[PDB]
A and B are shown apart, each in its own frame.
Chain A
């Protein structure tokens, strides 16, 4: 079961519903497409990658790699994470 997350520039990211529910803000916007007028695709792609990362490595003994964030996207990604509470 999937949901669609739409970036400010029209990119449609399709992710598992349980992954998107990681964000309390997205849960509330769903309770199944969400438009984000302030989050451009280069930020929302990363957000979706964090869901995959979090779900894969939460409660796991296998060594955990660093979640990578280019300096260029860090400020915008911070603002998005604050908004999405994740």
Chain B
């Protein structure tokens, strides 16, 4: 269902990473499969060639944590006016304190050891319930 429209109309975009994370751009291809693209270090930008109606989202390349692009989940390149590129401001969401806590705990404890942690069962599930693109694609649909 969620897939890029095969418009064939070029659209230039600036991917601008105003997050402190390494950014993984993900293009949803014509059959809805996520295609990973080269990464952007923190604070960097790239002028890229995409197309009108194509779908993109952005993640942390290491952890797959979700990121926002122009304040939302999905970015769809639009028509270029006066030959100016479309800006895609990639930023950190305001994570819930819980989700932030989970990120930091995931970054310190190998997935083998989550069960050794002295916490309630549902938090162990929350830790193992990694941010995952496939899961988010189902939701958005």
Q: Which residues of A contact B (CB under 8 A)?
A: 47, 50, 53-54, 57-58, 61, 63-67, 69, 71, 74-75, 77-79, 81-82, 84-86
Contacts and interface: CB of A to CB of B under 8 A. Distances in A.
Given A69-B100, A74-B101, A74-B104, A79 B123 contact: yes
Contacts of A67: 95, 97, 100
Q: How large is the interface on B (under 10, 10 to 19, 20 to 34, 35 or more residues)?
A: 20 to 34
B119 to A, nearest CB: 6
A16 to B, nearest CB: 17
Given A65-B20, A66-B20, A78 B102 contact: yes
A27 B101 CA distance: 22
Contact of B94 (A64, A71, A79, A85): A64
Contacts of A81: 96-98, 101
Contact of A82 (B19, B98, B108): B98
A63 B91 contact: yes
**Which of A78, A79, A82 has most B Cβ within 10 Å?**
A78
B96 A78 contact: no
B2 interface: no
A50 B97 CA distance: 7
B105 interface: yes
Given A63-B18, A82-B123, A74 B108 contact: yes
A86 B98 contact: yes
A85 B122 CA distance: 13
A78 B108 contact: no
B126 to A, nearest CB: 8
Interface string B94-122: 11111011101100100000000111101
A76 to B, nearest CB: 9
B18 to A, nearest CB: 5
Contacts of B118: 75
Interface in B28-61: none
B92 A66 contact: yes
A78 B109 CA distance: 14
Contacts of B119: 75, 78-79
A77 B96 CA distance: 12
